[PDB]
Design an enzyme around this catalytic site. Structure first.
Site, PDB file in Angstrom:
ATOM      1  N   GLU A  21       1.168  -1.012  -0.459  1.00 15.88           N
ATOM      2  CA  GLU A  21      -0.082   0.164   0.173  1.00 15.88           C
ATOM      3  C   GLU A  21       0.789   0.872  -0.034  1.00 15.88           C
ATOM      4  O   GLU A  21       1.584   1.360   0.988  1.00 15.88           O
ATOM      5  CB  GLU A  21      -0.864   0.148   1.257  1.00 15.88           C
ATOM      6  CG  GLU A  21      -1.739  -1.395   1.215  1.00 15.88           C
ATOM      7  CD  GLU A  21      -2.619  -1.265   2.740  1.00 15.88           C
ATOM      8  OE1 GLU A  21      -2.753  -0.141   2.895  1.00 15.88           O
ATOM      9  OE2 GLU A  21      -3.093  -1.799   3.046  1.00 15.88           O
TER      10      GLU A  21
ATOM     11  N   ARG B 278       7.259 -13.519   8.041  1.00 20.19           N
ATOM     12  CA  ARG B 278       7.629 -12.428   8.014  1.00 20.19           C
ATOM     13  C   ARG B 278       8.737 -12.182   9.359  1.00 20.19           C
ATOM     14  O   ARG B 278       9.346 -13.083   9.971  1.00 20.19           O
ATOM     15  CB  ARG B 278       6.804 -11.095   8.868  1.00 20.19           C
ATOM     16  CG  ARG B 278       6.265 -11.184  10.342  1.00 20.19           C
ATOM     17  CD  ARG B 278       5.918  -9.446  10.791  1.00 20.19           C
ATOM     18  NE  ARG B 278       6.516  -9.877  12.381  1.00 20.19           N
ATOM     19  CZ  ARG B 278       6.827  -9.433  13.144  1.00 20.19           C
ATOM     20  NH1 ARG B 278       7.921  -8.524  12.104  1.00 20.19           N
ATOM     21  NH2 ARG B 278       7.156  -8.766  14.431  1.00 20.19           N
TER      22      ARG B 278
ATOM     23  N   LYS C 198       4.715   0.605  12.171  1.00 16.76           N
ATOM     24  CA  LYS C 198       4.156   2.688  11.640  1.00 16.76           C
ATOM     25  C   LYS C 198       3.944   3.266  12.428  1.00 16.76           C
ATOM     26  O   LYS C 198       4.517   4.510  12.131  1.00 16.76           O
ATOM     27  CB  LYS C 198       3.101   2.575  10.940  1.00 16.76           C
TER      28      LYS C 198
END
Ligand SMILES: [Cl-]
Length: 548
Positions: free
Chosen positions: A29, A255, A265
Site C-alpha cells: 500500500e 515475516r 508504523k
C-alpha cells in the site's frame, strides 16, 4: 544457506516437466516507507522471479483514497531499485482494476452471492460473533437480486452518505473462519483518490481486491505473510465464484522478526515526530532509506535475506546476523583508510622540518585496488587514546619511553608529553627509527600498531558514530507504566567534530565506503558529504560488541 520452501515448490514444477513461467508480485500500500522487514518480501518476490527467469510485478495496493500516495510510490520504487531489482512491465495499481472489480461484484449479486446490508457498525460487529460464538445473518441478507442491484447502483451513483450501507459477500455467518462470515466487499466513502480522483465513491475491501488483482495480472504465486493465512479460504472463494481469467495460488511465509528492532508504523512515527531520530532516513532507523544512509550495501541485505531463508515458522532473527552481513561484505570489498577520530598532535623530533616522504599503502590487503599516498614527516596526528602516561594492564600502544609502530610507516618512541596549564596533553614529541620502514627493529620488540595521518594534508571532517537505536532485544516490551522509548540506547549517536582523515579521503564521494583502520566501516553520508569535504557515518564496528 537456509532453505527456501517456495524455491522448492517452483523447482518441483520444473522437475515434473512443467514449463510455465512464474509470475510473482510485491504489492505494498502506498501509505508508508519500507523497512528492513520489507526487504525480505522484496528479495523473495523479485528474487524468485529472477532465479527462474519469470516476472515480478510491482503493484501498489492503492484501493484506499488518500492524498499522499505519490510520496510513498516514489520512495518505494527507489528502495526496490536500490536493492537492485526491476519489476516486469509497467507499474501496476489496484485502482486500475476498479471497473472490473465493480463488474465482478455485480456478477456476484446476480448469482445471489452478494447483498446490500444497511447495518450500522455496532450491529455489524454484534452480528459478526466470535471464533467460538457463531454469527447471525444480516436482516438484509435475503434482499432480492433486483433490490440488491438497485441499491448497489445507487451506492455507486453517490446517493447515500459515508457508511450508510455496504455490499457483502453472501457466504456463511456460522463459518469457523471469520473471513467467511459475509465479508464486506464495498464501502461508501466520498473521497478524492490519488489515481481516479472523484470518479468513485464506493471502494473495494482488501479481500475483494487482493486475489482478483492477482488474477487480472496473471499472477501464478501470490506470496504474503502468515498474518493472512486465515484469509486463504476467502481468497479461494472469490476465485471459485467469479469468472476470473486466471487461478493464482496464495502461499504464506513468516515475516522477518528482527530483535532490537521496531518496524511498526505508529512507533516509527513517534520516533520521528518527537525528534528521537532526525527523520525517516536517520541511519539508526530500520527503514530501507535509513539502512542505505547508514552505509549498508544492497549486497549485504540480499545476502542476509538469502542466509535466513524462507519458511513458515515464526521466530526471531538476531540482528547480529545482519550486522555480520555488512561487516562481511565490506571486509571483502571496501578500500582501507586511516582517520584519526580524537587527534593528538605528534612531532617527530628527528625528522627534518620541511621534508616529506610519500609512503604508499595498499587500498586492500587482498584485492587489486591500488594505493593511497600518505605523506610522512615531522608533523602527524594520532588518536589521543593511543598514548597513556599510566597504562592499564595489557596496553599495547604508546607509553612514556615506549615504542609503537605507525601503520605502513616507522616505529616511533614517545619521548616527551607536552601539557597545557590544565594538565591536558596537547602534543606528543616522539623520535622515529629510520631503519624500520617495512622492517622490525633488530634486538627489541614493539607491541602494537596504530593508525595515524600527516598533519599537513589531513582532511578535517565530522564523523558520526552510530549504534543500535535500542538497547534491549525486545524494545516494545517495557515495564508497567513505561513505554518502548524507555529502551532507547543513549549511546546510539555520537557526533565527533574535528576528526583528521588521511588526504586520500579528501577525494571521497557521497556513498563511498571504507574500512577505517582500528575504528570500523564508514560511509561518506549521501546528503551531507560535499566535494572535498565528506561527512562519515559509522556503518558497523570492526567486530561484534553486543554478543547474543
Ligand atoms: Cl478492508
Amino acid at each position: 544457506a537456509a532453505p527456501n520452501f517456495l524455491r522448492q515448490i517452483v523447482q518441483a514444477d520444473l522437475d515434473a516437466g512443467k514449463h510455465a513461467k512464474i509470475v510473482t508480485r510485491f504489492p505494498p500500500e502506498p501509505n508508508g516507507y519500507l523497512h528492513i522487514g520489507h526487504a525480505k518480501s522484496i528479495c523473495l518476490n523479485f528474487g524468485l522471479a529472477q532465479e527462474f527467469a519469470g516476472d515480478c510485478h510491482l503493484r501498489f495496493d492503492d484501493t484506499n483514497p488518500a492524498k499522499e500516495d505519490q510520496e510513498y510510490i516514489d520512495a518505494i520504487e527507489a528502495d526496490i531499485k536500490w536493492l537492485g531489482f526491476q519489476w516486469s512491465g509497467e507499474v501496476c495499481y489496484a485502482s486500475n482494476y476498479f471497473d472490473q472489480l465493480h463488474a465482478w461484484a455485480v456478477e456476484l449479486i446476480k448469482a445471489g452471492k452478494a447483498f446490500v446490508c444497511d447495518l450500522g457498525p455496532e450491529e455489524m460487529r454484534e452480528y459478526r460473533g466470535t471464533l467460538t460464538e457463531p454469527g447471525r445473518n444480516s436482516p438484509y441478507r435475503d434482499r432480492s437480486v433486483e433490490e440488491n442491484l438497485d441499491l448497489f447502483a445507487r451506492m455507486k451513483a453517490g446517493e447515500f452518505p459515508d457508511g450508510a450501507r455496504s455490499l457483502r459477500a453472501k457466504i456463511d455467518m456460522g463459518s469457523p473462519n471469520m473471513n467467511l462470515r459475509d465479508p464486506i466487499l464495498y464501502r461508501i466513502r466520498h473521497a478524492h483518490h490519488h489515481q481516479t480522483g472523484d470518479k468513485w465513491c464506493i471502494y473495494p475491501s482488501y479481500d475483494f481486491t487482493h486475489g482478483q488483482s492477482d488474477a487480472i495480472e496473471g499472477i501464478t504465486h501470490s506470496i504474503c505473510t502468515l498474518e493472512f493465512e486465515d484469509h486463504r479460504p476467502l481468497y479461494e472463494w472469490f476465485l471459485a465464484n467469479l469468472p476470473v481469467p486466471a487461478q493464482p495460488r496464495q502461499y504464506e511465509f513468516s515475516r522477518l522478526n528482527l530483535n532490537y528492532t521496531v518496524t511498526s508504523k505508529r512507533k516509527l512515527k513517534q520516533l520521528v515526530d518527537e525528534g528521537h531520530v532526525s527523520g525517516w532516513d536517520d541511519p539508526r532507523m530500520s527503514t530501507l532509506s535509513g539502512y542505505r544512509r547508514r552505509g549498508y550495501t544492497p549486497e549485504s541485505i540480499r545476502n542476509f535475506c538469502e542466509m535466513i531463508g524462507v519458511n513458515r515458522a515464526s521466530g526471531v532473527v538476531d540482528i547480529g546476523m545482519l550486522e555480520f552481513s555488512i561487516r562481511d561484505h565490506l571486509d571483502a570489498t571496501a578500500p582501507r583508510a586511516m582517520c584519526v577520530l580524537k587527534p593528538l598532535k605528534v612531532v617527530i623530533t628527528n625528522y627534518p622540518e620541511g621534508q616529506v616522504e610519500n609512503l604508499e599503502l595498499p587500498r586492500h590487503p587482498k584485492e587489486d585496488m591500488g594505493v593511497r599516498v600518505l605523506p610522512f614527516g615531522r608533523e602527524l596526528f594520532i588518536d589521543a587514546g593511543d598514548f597513556e602516561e599510566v597504562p592499564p594492564a595489557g596496553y599495547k600502544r604508546l607509553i612514556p619511553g615506549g615504542e609503537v609502530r605507525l601503520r605502513g610507516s616507522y616505529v616511533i618512541r614517545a619521548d616527551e608529553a607536552i601539557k597545557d596549564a590544565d594538565g591536558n596533553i596537547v602534543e606528543l614529541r616522539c623520535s622515529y627509527d629510520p631503519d624500520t620502514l617495512g622492517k622490525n627493529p633488530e634486538g627489541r620488540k614493539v607491541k602494537g600498531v596504530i593508525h595515524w595521518v600527516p598533519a599537513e594534508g589531513s582532511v578535517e571532517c565530522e564523523v558520526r558514530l552510530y549504534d543500535r537505536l535500542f538497547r534491549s532485544a525486545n524494545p516494545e516490551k517495557a515495564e508497567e507504566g513505561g513505554s518502548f522509548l524507555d529502551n532507547i540506547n543513549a549511546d546510539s549517536l555520537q557526533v565527533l567534530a574535528g576528526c583528521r582523515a588521511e588526504p586520500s579521503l579528501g577525494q571521497a564521494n557521497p556513498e563511498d565506503r571504507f574500512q577505517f583502520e582500528r575504528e570500523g566501516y564508514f560511509v561518506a553520508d549521501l546528503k551531507d558529504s560535499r566535494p572535498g569535504k565528506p561527512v562519515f557515518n559509522r556503518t558497523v564496528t570492526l567486530r561484534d560488541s553486543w554478543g547474543q
